[PDB]
Design a protein around this nucleic acid. Sequence first.
DNA 1: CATCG
DNA 2: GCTAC
DNA 3: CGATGCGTAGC
Length: 257
Amino acid sequence: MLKIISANVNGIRSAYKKGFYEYIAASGADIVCVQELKAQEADLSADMKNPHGMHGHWHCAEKRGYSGVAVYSKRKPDNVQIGMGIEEFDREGRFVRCDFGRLSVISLYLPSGSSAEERQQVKYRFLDAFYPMLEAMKNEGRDIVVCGDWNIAHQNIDLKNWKGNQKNSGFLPEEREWIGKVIHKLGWTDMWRTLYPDVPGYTWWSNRGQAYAKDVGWRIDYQMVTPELAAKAVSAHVYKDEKFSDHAPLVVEYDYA
DNA sequence: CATCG
DNA sequence: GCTAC
DNA sequence: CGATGCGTAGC
């Protein structure tokens, strides 16, 4: 029995102030994947590195209060890879991977290109560099969960206002196409959609207007899983009882040992 | 990027 | 206040 | 539709 949680915390410190540290243990989660630390190794409390005695591995940005991802695990990773082998992005702490034997979990924070132009460009280049290793990972012939903030809504059902957002970063045709390829041409399972084909399952809501109240959201947080493990999926839900961030934790349970 | 006009 | 969101 | 504005965490 295996439970994986993926959460963009929007400031690890903010989240800890909002009750996330307790959630890490109450959830029963065996592995937690976090994005948007907004912190560097120095700013990290010991409780934000080894929560409840879990192991932990992180990759922080070369800028204070920016990006970074981590994975915490009740078990000790017999291997770990920080950064994705190309510095241009590794400078932004955007990719951590952990291998527990046959299993590999990775925390990913794909670049948001909504703020401005060059950001969109970088996002595209990131997709370019990433696709090949998504493929290689697929080919590894093992159980791999790539979870995190993919910053791309796949289809109309994946966001309330699909109509007016077709010209905004996050729902452009190219992005949806990329996702499509990684799911179909590459064979990665979008675990949530595959588990509940009709439920939207938003994971994010803009701070604008009353988006969070009117449930005007996006499903931009994924758990992309390999076929064999995917099939072993049994449950999933978006935890929404407490709010630790402008994202919500996405929890998936697999029958696996 | 929800919302207005 | 400023930045990236 | 296309044009207005705009909350947050952390420097």
